[PDB]
Amino acid sequence: MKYNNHDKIRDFIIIEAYMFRFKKKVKPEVDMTIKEFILLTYLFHQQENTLPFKKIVSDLCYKQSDLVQHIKVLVKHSYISKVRSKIDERNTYISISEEQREKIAERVTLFDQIIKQFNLADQSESQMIPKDSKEFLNLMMYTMYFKNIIKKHLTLSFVEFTILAIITSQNKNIVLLKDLIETIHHKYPQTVRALNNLKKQGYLIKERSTEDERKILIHMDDAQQDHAEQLLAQVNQLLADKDHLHLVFE
Known part of the structure; x- marks a missing residue:
């Protein structure tokens, strides 16, 4: 997951x-x-x-x-x-x-x-993980650089984007909200709000089971999958050939 x-x-x-x-x-x-x-x-x-x-x-x-x-x-x-x-x-x-x-x-x-x-x-x-100060510095700068790009080219927050990306890689499989919350470092409040906004805008589906109304299902239909794909594609382009892991040293 x-x-x-x-x-x-x-x-x-x-x-x-x-x-x-x-x-x-x-x-x-x-x-x-x-x-x-x-x-x-x-x-x-x-x-x-x-x-x-x-x-x-x-x-x-x-x-x-x-x-x-x-x-x-x-x-x-x-x-x-x-x-x-x-x-x-x-x-x-x-x-x-x-x-x-x-x-x-x-x-x-x-x-x-x-x-x-x-x-x-x-x-x-x-x-991936930094092995020493120099690497820590560079990787930390990459997270800041990535985040600046998100707010400059998209209207989604970096958290919503993370969630969209994760769900997009599930290729239409259904994901349970609690499995989603357990897998990411983001907490419940931030996660739920991110999903509610993603749903509202039309990026994905967020529904409940009809027999076990306790489960919260998250997934995308064909159209949504396609759009999200393009989107992840645009972003990957934006971060293309930039030596993203060495923005400061080496």
Whole structure:
């Protein structure tokens, strides 16, 4: 009861789910945020001992407003220092001394270990999963990139799209709502609302059994299958030849 296709959409679904599990287990046990670990990973992997802030804003998928504070946190904690631009004085440059690059390196080595240990304790079934900080960074950026594309070219949310894709790969087979909810990382509220909107718009059928009214059946008829197919096809095109798993490094 999974996404039965080996395209880039499958990549997103797998990674998005992995990131959910990772966050769930790690965020409570560690005081440094995941975004903070990713910023440090980025900063570690690049030669200049000094860079323009706008370079970080452009290289990663985070909005600038979501970076300003974590830079402050990283600064406050001596991982980096900030210098004002001598040209457009409203701009900023981040500097990394030999002493700071060392504090960063150890911190990224810790992240490497956290990822490794998580993978060992996790149902690491797929080969997709990040193996170290650099890979984690890239795959995390892919989920953000995938999501931006969804809201730019479609009217559906990324959750509704996930659900549509999963059901579409069932080739007309009937799926039970509770089997669907059990298989995905998304919770009941979000899932049901996604299905109700998908039904309403006409993407799929959501009906109840007539003898065992307890079961909620989800599936698509010929027409709907066809449309969904085209749709998954368009999206896969949009993500075509982009080195989606290496948007930042390598």
